[PDB]
Amino acid sequence: DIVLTQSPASLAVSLGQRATISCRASKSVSTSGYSYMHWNQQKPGQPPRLLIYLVSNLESGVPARFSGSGSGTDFTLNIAPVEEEDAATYYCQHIAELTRTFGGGTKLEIKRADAAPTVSIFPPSSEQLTSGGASVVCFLNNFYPKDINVKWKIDGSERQNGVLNSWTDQDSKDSTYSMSSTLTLTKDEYERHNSYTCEATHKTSTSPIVKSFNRNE
Amino acid sequence: QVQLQQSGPELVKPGASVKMSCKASGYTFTDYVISWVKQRTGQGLEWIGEFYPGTDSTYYTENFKGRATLTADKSSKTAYMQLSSLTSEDSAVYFCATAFDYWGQGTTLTVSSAATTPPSVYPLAPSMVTLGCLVKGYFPEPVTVTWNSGSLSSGVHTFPAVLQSDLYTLSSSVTVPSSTWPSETVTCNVAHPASSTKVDKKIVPR
Amino acid sequence: KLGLITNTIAGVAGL
C-alpha cells in the first residue's frame, strides 16, 4: 500500500498561534484529474469530520481558519489561528491510489509551562487482601509534558511483570497530563516481600521521583 | 442533510459473526459510496472496503477479503457490514461513511468470551492529600466514578480501563486539601450498569 | 451509476 506519513505525531500549541500539520505520500497522489489528499478532524469519543478535500477544498461548514496546500507527495494543513474547538487529533488520507490509506494522525495540544508529577503510591487495600489478590497503585498526576517513564521495584530489584498502565488526555483545565500504574500480585507473593517502590522519571527532574513503602510499618 | 444511523454497540464471542447496520438519510442512496473504516481504540484509521449501492459494486481489503461481507437494502436506504470468524483483535469502532464525506457515530464492537462480571471496588487510603479507589475485574465497559456524588469535581482524575484476562480494571484519584480530610468525608461512587451494581466507598485513614 | 459524489473519492473501488 501507499504509506502516508504524518508529522508531528503531536503538536503543542498555544491558543491563538497558527498550526501547520504535515502529510507526506509514498507516491504522487494525483489521479487522472485531481489530487485526492484529504484532512479530517477527530475529537475524543466522536467520529472524524471532513475539513479539507482534494488538497485545498473547504468542506461545507468549516471556517476560513482552516487551509490546505501542497502538491504531489507533500501536503500541509494550516490552522490560523487555533481555537478551543480545534484542539484534537488530525488525520490526512489519500484516495488517488488504492487501497485507500490514512496517516498516523497528529495530536493538537495546548502548550504550557513544564510541570512536576505528583507521585502517590498505595498498598493493596485491606478489602482486596482478604479477597485473594493484591494491587499496588502508583499515581502520577498533573505533569507536563506528557512523556514519562514508570519503574516498579520490589525489595530493591526491578519488577515489570504484572504492571499495568493507563494515561489521561491533556487536562482541559490546567492542560497537564497524568497516568496510573498498577502492580498486581497474589496475596501470597505480595506478603512475601517488603519494599514496594515506584520511580517516575520525567524531563522535569534529573532525579527520578521515588515513592516507596514497607509492609513492616 | 447527509446522516448516518449506525447500529448500536455489539457484544459477541470469538468465532462468531456480526452484521452491523448503517442507515443513510438526507440524500439519494445511490449517489454516495459507503465506506467502512476501522479504528481500534486509541489507534489510527484503517480502510476496510466499500459498497456502492449504485451498482452494488464492492471492494475488500486483503485483511477482510474472506471475513467481511458488505451489503445494502436500497428499500430502506441502509447498508450493512458483516464480519465473520471474529476475534479479540476485531474489537474496535467501525464507522460507515458516505465516501469519507460524512461519518456515522460508528459501532463499537466488543468480541470476548467474558460474561457479565461486577467490579470489586477497593479504597486507596494514604499541603494537599491524594485519595483514590481501584475498580478491578469488571465486564463489560463502561464504569462510572464520581467523588462525593459529584460534589468533588476539581482535582479528580479518572483513568481509562485496562484489559486483564477478559476483565476490565480501572482506578481513579482525587486530591483534596489535607485539612478537609479525614476531617471531612470523602467517598468515591462506583457504578457498573451492566451488572446492575453500585458501590459507595468512604475513604478512611489506615 | 452516473450520479456519483466525488468530493473525496474518484470513483468506485470495484475497478
Phi and psi, residue A85, nearest 5°: -70, -5
Considering only CA atoms, which of B100, C8, B98 is closest in space to residue A55?
Answer: C8
Phi and psi, residue A147, nearest 5°: -55, 130
When CB atoms are compared, the residue of A100, A124, A141 closest to B157 is A141
Considering only CA atoms, which of A14, A127, A173, A100 is closest in space to residue B59?
Answer: A100
Chain A residues bordering chain B (beta-carbon distance below 8 Å): 38, 40, 46-50, 53, 59, 91, 93, 95, 98-105, 118, 120, 122, 124-125, 127-128, 131, 133, 135, 137, 139, 141, 164-168, 173, 178-180, 182, 184
What is the architecture of the domain spanning A112-215?
Sandwich (2.60)
Kind of pairing, strands A106-110 and A10-13? parallel
Note the CATH number of domain A6-111.
2.60.40.10
Measured between beta carbons, the chain B residues lying within 8 angstroms of C1 are 54-55
Indicate the helix (H) or strand (E) that contains A126. helix A126-129
Strand partners, A53: A57
DSSP code of residue A175: -
Instruction: In chain A, list all ranges with CATH 2.60.40.10.
Output: 6-111, 112-215
Q: Which residues contact B180 (CB under 8 A, 6 or more apart)?
A: none
Between CA B116 and CA A158 the distance in angstroms is: 35
When CB atoms are compared, the residue of C5, C8, C15 closest to B31 is C5
Residue ranges of domains in chain B, CATH in brackets = 1-114 (2.60.40.10), 115-206 (2.60.40.10)
The set of cell numbers assigned to B173 is: 484519584
* Residue pointed to by grid coordinates 467474558: B114
Kind of pairing, strands A133-143 and A177-186? antiparallel
Q: Please spell the DSSP secondary structure of B30-71, one letter per residue.
A: GGS-EEEEEE-TTS--EEEEEEETTTTEEEE-GGGTTT-EEE
Q: Please spell the DSSP secondary structure of B172-205, one letter per residue.
A: EEEEEEGGGSSSS--EEEEEETTTTEEEEEE---
Between CA A135 and CA A124 the distance in angstroms is: 5
Q: Sheet containing A57-58: give its strands across.
A: A10-13, A106-110, A89-94, A37-42, A48-53, A57-58
The set of cell numbers assigned to B181 is: 480530610
The set of cell numbers assigned to B97 is: 461513511
Query: Does the distance separating the beta carbons of C8 and B55 come in below 8 Å?
Result: no
Q: Is A140 within 8 Å of B159 (Cβ atoms)?
A: no
Peptide bond into B119 cis (omega under 30): no
Secondary-structure percent of chain A, ordered helix, strand, coil, rounded to 5: 5, 50, 45
Q: CA torsion A120→A126→A132→A137, rounded to 10°?
A: -10
Q: Is A152 within 8 Å of A180 (Cβ atoms)?
A: no
Query: Does the distance separating the beta carbons of C13 and A50 come in below 8 Å?
Result: no
